[PDB]
Amino acid sequence: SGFRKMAFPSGKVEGCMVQVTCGTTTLNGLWLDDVVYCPRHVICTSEDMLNPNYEDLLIRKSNHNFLVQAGNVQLRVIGHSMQNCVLKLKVDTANPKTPKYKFVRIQPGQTFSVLACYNGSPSGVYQCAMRPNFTIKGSFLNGSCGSVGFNIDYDCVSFCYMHHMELPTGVHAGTDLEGNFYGPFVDRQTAQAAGTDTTITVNVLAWLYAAVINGDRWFLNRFTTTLNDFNLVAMKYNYEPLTQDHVDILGPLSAQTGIAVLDMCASLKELLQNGMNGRTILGSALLEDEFTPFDVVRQCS
Amino acid sequence: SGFRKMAFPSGKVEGCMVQVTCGTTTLNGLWLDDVVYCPRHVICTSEDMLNPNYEDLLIRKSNHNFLVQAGNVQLRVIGHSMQNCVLKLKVDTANPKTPKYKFVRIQPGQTFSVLACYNGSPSGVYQCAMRPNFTIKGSFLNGSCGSVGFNIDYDCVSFCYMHHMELPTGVHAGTDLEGNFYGPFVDRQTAQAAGTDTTITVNVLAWLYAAVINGDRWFLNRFTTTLNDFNLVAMKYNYEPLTQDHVDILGPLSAQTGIAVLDMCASLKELLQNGMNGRTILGSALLEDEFTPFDVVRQCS
Ligand SMILES: *C(=N)CC(=O)N(c1ccc(-c2ccccc2)cc1)[C@@H](C(=O)N[C@@H](C)c1ccccc1)c1cccnc1
Numbered sequence: 065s066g067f068r069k070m071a072f073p074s075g076k077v078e079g080c081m082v083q084v085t086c087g088t089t090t091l092n093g094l095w096l097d098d099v100v101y102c103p104r105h106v107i108c109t110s111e112d113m114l115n116p117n118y119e120d121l122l123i124r125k126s127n128h129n130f131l132v133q134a135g136n137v138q139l140r141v142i143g144h145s146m147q148n149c150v151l152k153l154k155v156d157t158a159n160p161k162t163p164k165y166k167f168v169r170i171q172p173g174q175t176f177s178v179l180a181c182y183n184g185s186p187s188g189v190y191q192c193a194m195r196p197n198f199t200i201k202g203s204f205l206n207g208s209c210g211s212v213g214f215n216i217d218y219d220c221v222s223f224c225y226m227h228h229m230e231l232p233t234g235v236h237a238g239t240d241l242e243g244n245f246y247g248p249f250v251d252r253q254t255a256q257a258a259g260t261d262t263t264i265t266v267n268v269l270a271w272l273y274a275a276v277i278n279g280d281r282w283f284l285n286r287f288t289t290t291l292n293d294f295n296l297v298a299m300k301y302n303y304e305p306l307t308q309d310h311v312d313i314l315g316p317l318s319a320q321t322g323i324a325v326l327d328m329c330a331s332l333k334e335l336l337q338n339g340m341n342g343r344t345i346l347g348s349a350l351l352e353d354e355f356t357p358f359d360v361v362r363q364c365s
Numbered sequence: 366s367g368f369r370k371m372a373f374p375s376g377k378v379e380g381c382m383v384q385v386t387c388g389t390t391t392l393n394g395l396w397l398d399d400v401v402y403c404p405r406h407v408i409c410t411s412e413d414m415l416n417p418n419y420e421d422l423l424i425r426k427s428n429h430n431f432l433v434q435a436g437n438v439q440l441r442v443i444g445h446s447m448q449n450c451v452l453k454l455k456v457d458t459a460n461p462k463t464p465k466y467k468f469v470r471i472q473p474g475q476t477f478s479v480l481a482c483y484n485g486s487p488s489g490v491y492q493c494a495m496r497p498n499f500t501i502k503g504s505f506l507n508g509s510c511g512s513v514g515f516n517i518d519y520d521c522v523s524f525c526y527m528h529h530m531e532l533p534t535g536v537h538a539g540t541d542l543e544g545n546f547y548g549p550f551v552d553r554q555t556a557q558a559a560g561t562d563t564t565i566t567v568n569v570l571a572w573l574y575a576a577v578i579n580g581d582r583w584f585l586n587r588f589t590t591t592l593n594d595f596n597l598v599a600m601k602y603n604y605e606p607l608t609q610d611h612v613d614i615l616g617p618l619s620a621q622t623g624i625a626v627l628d629m630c631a632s633l634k635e636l637l638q639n640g641m642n643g644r645t646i647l648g649s650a651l652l653e654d655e656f657t658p659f660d661v662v663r664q665c666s
């Protein structure tokens with residue numbers, strides 16, 4: 065029994081985290097094979113932040129200009145380039161601790177583990193969701209940039225996120241490992257705003273299933289409902305519409321609790337309409353949308 | 366900016382987690398130097414659970430009876446013993462991945478990282494507190510026993526908890542690495558009950574400081590209060606009395622927010638008396654007592 069925000073083991077990734085330097089600019093990088101990835105805003109100075117031309121700035125630099133530190137060692141830069149918003153710094157040495165990995169672009173609602181790093185030293189691990197507005201409500205301080213988000217599949221690390229920047233709102237934005245930002249965010253010091261942050265309906269449901277399974281089942285109602293019916297109540301409270309796919313994906317949970325999806329939806333409709341009256345689910349006083357169905361299945365089996 | 370339940374990197378510990386077997390009983394073990402630690406309830410069978418004599422059961426076993434698996438390898442048992450509630454299984458091979466470590470007995474209110482393991486494979490990492498009743502509200506399934514709790518200090522893993530058993534309440538109990546249980550719990554299948562679970566006053570305060578620092582400062586009040594005054598309101602709501610030590614320990618946070626401890630206490634007195642009205646602090650709809658002052662300092666610098 066028990067349920068908490070659980071991250072993947074961070075060992076396979078710890079050993080890939082190096083330090084990357086330019087004058088008064090240092091941030092973390094990811095060393096895989098004979099390549100070191102980092103955010104390209106490492107080359108900018110507080111003089112050309114409002115609107116950098118990265119092509120032009122990159123030109124002003126050559127292989128020897130970048131200090132690639134792993135532990136107390138140094139690496140030799142041999143070839144550099146710019147893939148969208150990331151630096152690909154080719155090094156003489158391939159990482160001996162390079163796990164089987166893939167780069168994958170995650171979908172809004174999917175969760176991943178973040179290893180927060182300062183100065184190339186892994187500081188801490190925590191679980192995170194790609195919010196529907198393509199932001200993440202993470203815990204990054206100054207120097208956290210280059211920190212990576214990942215899932216572990218069999219023996220294979222799936223890297224999905226590199227952290228670039230905090231938004232005035234205090235939320236966080238960054239790229240896939242091919243250098244594309246999640247959302248419409250740009251790597252410059254201009255007014256960017258996150259859009260309406262909706263709630264991940266299929267996740268909140270996965271939560272309640274988790275709750276039922278642990279023994280919290282007070283909020284279960286005698287009623288039922290329709291997808292259409294329920295979806296018209298979702299929109300009202302700014303919730304992700306629920307699709308049949310979403311219904312299908314919850315099947316495993318349905319089949320373990322002997323509880324139809326729609327009955328659980330009808331309980332959510334109540335909690336949404338009625339509030340929680342000062343009661344609590346899995347020791348939370350509000351509805352939690354940062355666990356996928358898969359997340360809950362793993363922790364509940 | 367940002368604040369979440371953050372664990373220590375789990376690499377140094379991942380490589381210490383082995384599998385331990387007896388007939389139809391398998392659980393995780395911790396391999397440090399030429400020793401493998403695990404819960405001694407590994408030798409019991411569902412026939413002698415109500416009241417085992419472990420001395421007598423241990424006698425019935427010899428070095429070759431125990432299957433110590435690390436990855437796809439096997440280890441050779443050379444000397445075995447019983448330290449309070451743990452097995453010390455001497456092996457021919459010392460762990461090549463043995464970090465600098467210490468065994469430390471944690472105090473109620475202190476936090477640590479748990480690496481949850483099934484079948485000797487690290488499954489997941491999450492942050493945990495020693496509750497004042499010496500239980501932990503963790504996430505363990507069947508086979509999780511032998512999973513360890515730790516802090517990392519400089520380069521030194523401090524092991525504080527080995528997990529043994531779930532209590533009817535669904536909370537969790539286990540030992541230090543010298544085999545002593547936290548609390549009055551015993552490794553047998555008898556009625557044991559956790560005592561009154563109080564709230565960790567110094568932690569809730571550390572939280573609010575964290576909140577203020579991120580920008581959530583609505584609950585700040587124009588009032589103040591006295592330790593005595595506040596403590597008489599603590600007891601009412603089942604809270605840890607606040608000591609001058611507790612006041613001292615919060616100093617760093619005081620000094621960064623320019624806010625006197627007692628003023629923060631006076632805000633807590635309000636929230637305790639008044640509730641939260643449907644407002645939220647660091648995206649929580651209730652007061653959070655599972656971060657130490659140190660925890661908050663690290664994440665907030
Ligand atoms: C990463 N290690 C650097 C860092 O921590 N932050 C950051 C600084 C500068 C830039 C940047 C400079 C020039 C051109 C393009 C980007 C990006 C990130 C900051 C941070 O993001 N501050 C925000 C408000 C910001 C200022 C100016 C430009 C962009 C963004 C940071 C703080 C806390 C957590 N993560 C990052």
Ligand SMILES: *C(=N)CC(=O)N(c1ccc(-c2ccccc2)cc1)[C@@H](C(=O)N[C@@H](C)c1ccccc1)c1cccnc1
Pocket residue numbers: 065391392393406409410411413414415417505506507508509510511529530531532533552553554555
């Ligand atoms: C650990 N891998 C085994 C396990 O998962 N649990 C457990 C089983 C049996 C015993 C035990 C048997 C004989 C003598 C002494 C102890 C301890 C732990 C269970 C668990 O703790 N179930 C509880 C209800 C229990 C039953 C009987 C005796 C003690 C305890 C477990 C479930 C979920 C999470 N962690 C452990």
